[PDB]
Design an enzyme around this catalytic site. Structure first.
Site, mmCIF file in Angstrom:
data_model
loop_
_atom_site.group_PDB
_atom_site.id
_atom_site.type_symbol
_atom_site.label_atom_id
_atom_site.label_comp_id
_atom_site.label_asym_id
_atom_site.label_seq_id
_atom_site.Cartn_x
_atom_site.Cartn_y
_atom_site.Cartn_z
ATOM 1 N N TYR A 239 -24.229 33.113 78.542
ATOM 2 C CA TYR A 239 -25.286 32.840 77.586
ATOM 3 C C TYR A 239 -26.223 31.725 78.071
ATOM 4 O O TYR A 239 -25.798 30.900 78.901
ATOM 5 C CB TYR A 239 -24.662 32.461 76.202
ATOM 6 C CG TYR A 239 -23.988 31.102 76.088
ATOM 7 C CD1 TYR A 239 -24.769 29.985 75.774
ATOM 8 C CD2 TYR A 239 -22.635 30.937 76.340
ATOM 9 C CE1 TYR A 239 -24.194 28.728 75.718
ATOM 10 C CE2 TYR A 239 -22.052 29.666 76.293
ATOM 11 C CZ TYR A 239 -22.840 28.569 75.981
ATOM 12 O OH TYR A 239 -22.284 27.307 75.921
ATOM 13 N N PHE B 22 -31.067 24.428 75.690
ATOM 14 C CA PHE B 22 -30.180 23.326 75.346
ATOM 15 C C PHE B 22 -28.822 23.488 76.031
ATOM 16 O O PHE B 22 -28.042 22.533 76.097
ATOM 17 C CB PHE B 22 -30.020 23.225 73.817
ATOM 18 C CG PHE B 22 -29.624 24.463 73.023
ATOM 19 C CD1 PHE B 22 -28.279 24.822 72.908
ATOM 20 C CD2 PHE B 22 -30.616 25.182 72.359
ATOM 21 C CE1 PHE B 22 -27.937 25.901 72.115
ATOM 22 C CE2 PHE B 22 -30.246 26.260 71.566
ATOM 23 C CZ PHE B 22 -28.913 26.618 71.444
ATOM 24 N N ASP B 23 -28.490 24.691 76.503
ATOM 25 C CA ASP B 23 -27.226 24.907 77.232
ATOM 26 C C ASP B 23 -27.176 26.308 77.811
ATOM 27 O O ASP B 23 -27.868 27.171 77.290
ATOM 28 C CB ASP B 23 -25.967 24.762 76.352
ATOM 29 C CG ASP B 23 -24.705 24.633 77.223
ATOM 30 O OD1 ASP B 23 -24.689 23.804 78.127
ATOM 31 O OD2 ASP B 23 -23.755 25.370 77.059
ATOM 32 N N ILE C 162 -20.510 30.076 65.835
ATOM 33 C CA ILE C 162 -21.387 30.106 64.688
ATOM 34 C C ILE C 162 -21.502 31.544 64.160
ATOM 35 O O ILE C 162 -21.365 32.556 64.894
ATOM 36 C CB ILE C 162 -22.836 29.503 65.035
ATOM 37 C CG1 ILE C 162 -23.433 30.071 66.329
ATOM 38 C CG2 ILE C 162 -22.696 27.980 65.158
ATOM 39 C CD1 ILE C 162 -24.941 29.792 66.566
ATOM 40 N N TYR D 32 -26.373 26.030 62.603
ATOM 41 C CA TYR D 32 -25.923 24.679 62.247
ATOM 42 C C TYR D 32 -26.550 24.086 60.958
ATOM 43 O O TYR D 32 -26.312 22.921 60.577
ATOM 44 C CB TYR D 32 -26.211 23.800 63.472
ATOM 45 C CG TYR D 32 -25.390 24.205 64.678
ATOM 46 C CD1 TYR D 32 -24.007 23.982 64.709
ATOM 47 C CD2 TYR D 32 -26.017 24.848 65.736
ATOM 48 C CE1 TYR D 32 -23.247 24.411 65.784
ATOM 49 C CE2 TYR D 32 -25.263 25.276 66.809
ATOM 50 C CZ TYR D 32 -23.898 25.058 66.825
ATOM 51 O OH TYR D 32 -23.181 25.516 67.912
ATOM 52 N N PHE E 66 -30.535 32.933 71.535
ATOM 53 C CA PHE E 66 -29.538 33.000 72.593
ATOM 54 C C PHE E 66 -29.774 34.255 73.444
ATOM 55 O O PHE E 66 -30.059 35.328 72.915
ATOM 56 C CB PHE E 66 -28.143 33.075 72.011
ATOM 57 C CG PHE E 66 -27.565 31.779 71.535
ATOM 58 C CD1 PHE E 66 -27.776 31.361 70.217
ATOM 59 C CD2 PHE E 66 -26.824 31.010 72.413
ATOM 60 C CE1 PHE E 66 -27.235 30.168 69.811
ATOM 61 C CE2 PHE E 66 -26.287 29.815 71.983
ATOM 62 C CZ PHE E 66 -26.493 29.396 70.685
#
Ligand SMILES: CCC(C)(C)C(=O)C(=O)N1CCC[C@H]1C(=O)OCCCc1cccnc1
Length: 107
Positions: free
Chosen positions: A26, A36-37, A56, A82, A99
């Site tokens: 991902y 962000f990642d 999530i 979140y 994502f």
């Protein structure tokens, strides 16, 4: 909710079931494209078990729509991610997450 938009098709027949381990690559981005990642940067797939409540809600719901081999973009509303907390320091309150997820394998 989560919106699933395909990048590359999967086999169209092997969809993850509760209790199975999904092995995914991902890259997570904010709506402006900021990453962000990414497990692709670590070159090690991320594993989670479907239905165990450890990712999530837009992931449980979105990746369950994917067949093995498929690469898709999941756009996830804050209430499916979140919410108003965000993730301290990484995700703001009320953020929509994007994502790029590839379902590699089920174990
Ligand atoms: C930023 C946190 C990190 C690196 C795990 C991430 O990006 C992430 O959440 N990620 C990255 C890949 C999977 C996803 C996830 O598992 O969501 C977990 C968030 C929900 C949760 C569960 C238990 C305790 N706190 C939060």
């Amino acid at each position: 909710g989560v919106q699933v938009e395909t990048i590359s098709p999967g086999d169209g027949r092997t969809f993850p079931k509760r209790g199975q381990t999904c092995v995914v690559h991902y890259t997570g981005m904010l709506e402006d494209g900021k990453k962000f990642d990414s497990s692709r940067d670590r070159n090690k797939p991320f594993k989670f078990m479907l239905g165990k409540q450890e990712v999530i809600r837009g992931w449980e719901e979105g990746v369950a729509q994917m067949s093995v081999g498929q690469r898709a973009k999941l756009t996830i509303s804050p209430d499916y991610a979140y919410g108003a907390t965000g993730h301290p320091g990484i995700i703001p309150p009320h953020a929509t997450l994007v994502f790029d997820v590839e379902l590699l394998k089920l174990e």
